[PDB]
Amino acid sequence: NKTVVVTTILESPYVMMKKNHEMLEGNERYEGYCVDLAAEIAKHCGFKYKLTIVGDGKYGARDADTKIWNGMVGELVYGKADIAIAPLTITLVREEVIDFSKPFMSLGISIMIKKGTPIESAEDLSKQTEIAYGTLDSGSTKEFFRRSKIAVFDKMWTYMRSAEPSVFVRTTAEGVARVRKSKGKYAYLLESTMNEYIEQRKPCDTMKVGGNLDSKGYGIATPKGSSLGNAVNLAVLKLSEQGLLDKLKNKWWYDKGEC
Amino acid sequence: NKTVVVTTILESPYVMMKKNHEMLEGNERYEGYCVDLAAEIAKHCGFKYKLTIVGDGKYGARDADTKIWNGMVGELVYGKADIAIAPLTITLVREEVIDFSKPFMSLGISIMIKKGTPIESAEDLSKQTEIAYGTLDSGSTKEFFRRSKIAVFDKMWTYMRSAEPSVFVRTTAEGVARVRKSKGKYAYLLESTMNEYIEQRKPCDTMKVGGNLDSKGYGIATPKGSSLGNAVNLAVLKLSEQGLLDKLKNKWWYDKGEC
Numbered sequence: 251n252k253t254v255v256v257t258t259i260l261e262s263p264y265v266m267m268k269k270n271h272e273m274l275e276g277n278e279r280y281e282g283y284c285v286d287l288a289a290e291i292a293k294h295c296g297f298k299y300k301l302t303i304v305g306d307g308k309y310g311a312r313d314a315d316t317k318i319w320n321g322m323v324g325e326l327v328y329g330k331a332d333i334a335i336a337p338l339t340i341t342l343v344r345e346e347v348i349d350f351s352k353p354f355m356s357l358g359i360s361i362m363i364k365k366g367t368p369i370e371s372a373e374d375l376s377k378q379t380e381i382a383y384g385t386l387d388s389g390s391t392k393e394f395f396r397r398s399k400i401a402v403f404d405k406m407w408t409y410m411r412s413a414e415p416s417v418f419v420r421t422t423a424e425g426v427a428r429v430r431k432s433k434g435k436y437a438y439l440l441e442s443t444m445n446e447y448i449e450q451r452k453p454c455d456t457m458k459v460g461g462n463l464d465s466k467g468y469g470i471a472t473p474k475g476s477s478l479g480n481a482v483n484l485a486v487l488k489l490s491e492q493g494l495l496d497k498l499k500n501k502w503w504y505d506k507g508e509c
Numbered sequence: 510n511k512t513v514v515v516t517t518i519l520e521s522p523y524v525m526m527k528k529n530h531e532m533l534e535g536n537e538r539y540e541g542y543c544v545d546l547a548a549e550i551a552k553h554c555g556f557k558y559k560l561t562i563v564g565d566g567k568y569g570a571r572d573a574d575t576k577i578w579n580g581m582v583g584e585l586v587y588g589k590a591d592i593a594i595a596p597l598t599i600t601l602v603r604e605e606v607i608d609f610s611k612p613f614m615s616l617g618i619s620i621m622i623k624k625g626t627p628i629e630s631a632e633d634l635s636k637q638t639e640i641a642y643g644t645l646d647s648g649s650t651k652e653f654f655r656r657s658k659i660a661v662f663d664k665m666w667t668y669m670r671s672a673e674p675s676v677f678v679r680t681t682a683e684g685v686a687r688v689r690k691s692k693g694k695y696a697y698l699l700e701s702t703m704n705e706y707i708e709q710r711k712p713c714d715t716m717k718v719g720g721n722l723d724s725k726g727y728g729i730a731t732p733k734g735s736s737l738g739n740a741v742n743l744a745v746l747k748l749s750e751q752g753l754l755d756k757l758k759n760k761w762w763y764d765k766g767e768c
């Protein structure tokens with residue numbers, strides 16, 4: 251019986267450093283939605299675990315011409331972690347190389363603007379040029395636009411992939427800072443979950459506008475054919491049905507919202 | 510190469526008899542979201558199929574005494590069908606005996622009222638007796654209330670399980686008709702998908718009120734360990750990422766709206 255290595259990512263409010271983390275040890279250094287969820291999954295499946303932050307700070311993408319997976323997906327694919335408990339989006343290209351539980355949280359790509367920005371939709375972004383816009387790198391949102399055959403989204407991708415300087419950012423935090431610092435001249439495309447969270451945080455100067463561009467979910471991921479997969483899947487469904495996932499969302503998004 | 514037997518259920522707008530069904534044969538008798546979905550799934554997985562309407566007209570529940578499954582779930586469990594393509598809710602007790610694809614559509618339990626009924630929430634229903642309320646039999650909504658430790662819902666189940674005359678119905682259509690003819694003295698608990706569909710159909714006298722009580726999804730189901738399960742799962746994700754599922758939702762819900 252071995253300690254399960256959990257890969258996750260510093261992404262608020264999923265996993266964050268506790269204020270006093272320096273004086274704490276192991277799993278106690280972290281807090282957030284996925285820290286709470288990991289404890290519950292492990293309890294219900296009966297395993298001990300170690301939270302580890304993914305080394306390259308990425309979600310997971312396959313390099314073209316190198317074909318190596320980076321991020322949390324890479325940690326699973328190459329045997330460095332036993333399970334990923336993170337806001338990791340269920341996508342076809344990932345499900346081909348790793349296993350996902352049923353989803354524990356729903357989301358869709360969405361638009362973040364600085365308040366007052368003259369934008370209400372993706373169509374709006376696509377039909378103008380004054381306001382720049384981009385996505386996270388090495389994630390499922392970038393891939394959505396890269397692959398889309400829908401005219402509005404193809405138009406946005408054609409713009410974003412060629413825009414200079416780059417409209418892509420390394421972390422969600424970078425995208426949010428760029429929105430806040432650009433006086434309305436930058437909009438950020440990110441998952442509704444993260445958008446909704448930031449909307450509840452000081453300085454309360456951003457907001458989600460328009461509907462979501464797609465509809466999908468986060469899943470708990472394991473290496474393909476892992477024996478952990480079945481129990482983890484059943485645990486997600488149990489925690490869903492018992493209302494835990496709704497409680498955790500309220501706790502980390504809304505209960506202590508600052509706006 | 511064998512023709513795949515698909516079990517499904519007559520439930521609008523998922524599977525409906527075409528107006529001219531009496532002169533049509535086989536799969537062409539039927540239309541709707543799940544008829545379209547079946548055709549897409551079959552094309553991407555490369556099989557031929559026959560749509561069959563579930564014999565007992567039920568989704569699926571286990572008899573507490575005999576432990577025998579009925580409905581579509583039973584047809585899969587006992588080898589009568591190869592796959593279920595229907596608004597079949599992903600649940601823990603079901604996933605223990607059959608396999609589900611990743612979800613193709615989201616839903617939550619919701620309240621249907623006759624327009625003008627003084628009800629805004631589940632909490633409202635629980636705190637009164639003038640307006641009776643019930644659910645579908647042999648489905649996931651009934652099981653939700655039976656197994657709910659949440660205060661308001663637990664209170665609701667105690668009322669419903671002992672209600673006389675019975676507040677439970679055999680079909681969604683029976684529930685809706687009961688709302689429409691009870692002059693506001695019956696409210697129906699049903700999935701948001703079906704609620705939102707009915708609200709857009711003549712005679713436009715019903716309404717979805719309040720938020721959803723939970724958050725979950727429908728999946729394509731296969732018997733445990735079936736060879737079809739893998740391909741079906743990937744096909745759902747492909748259709749999701751293509752925007753096809755969104756297209757079908759708009760086609761059958763809102764393009765066909767008449768209120």
Ligand SMILES: CCN(Cc1cc(=O)n2nc(C)sc2n1)c1ccccc1
Nearest residue numbers: 353355356466467612613614615725726
């Ligand atoms: C997260 C709660 N859901 C809803 C949900 C999640 C999700 O990824 N997608 N993708 C779609 C395409 S429709 C949808 N609905 C859920 C949870 C467990 C089992 C099924 C659903």
Ligand SMILES: N[C@@H](CCC(=O)O)C(=O)O
Nearest residue numbers: 309337338339389390391
């Ligand atoms: N959740 C995304 C990362 C965030 C984004 O791409 O917007 C993923 O799994 O790649």
Ligand SMILES: N[C@@H](CCC(=O)O)C(=O)O
Nearest residue numbers: 568596597598648649650
């Ligand atoms: N979709 C439900 C049936 C409808 C309901 O229970 O409200 C099921 O799979 O059981």
Ligand SMILES: C[As](C)(=O)[O-]
Nearest residue numbers: 289290293294295
């Ligand atoms: C397994 As428990 C009810 O202590 O989270």
Ligand SMILES: [Zn+2]
Nearest residue numbers: 267269271272
């Ligand atoms: Zn620190």
Ligand SMILES: [Zn+2]
Nearest residue numbers: 290293294494
């Ligand atoms: Zn628990």
Ligand SMILES: [Zn+2]
Nearest residue numbers: 549552553753
């Ligand atoms: Zn197709």
Ligand SMILES: [Zn+2]
Nearest residue numbers: 663664666667
């Ligand atoms: Zn009770």
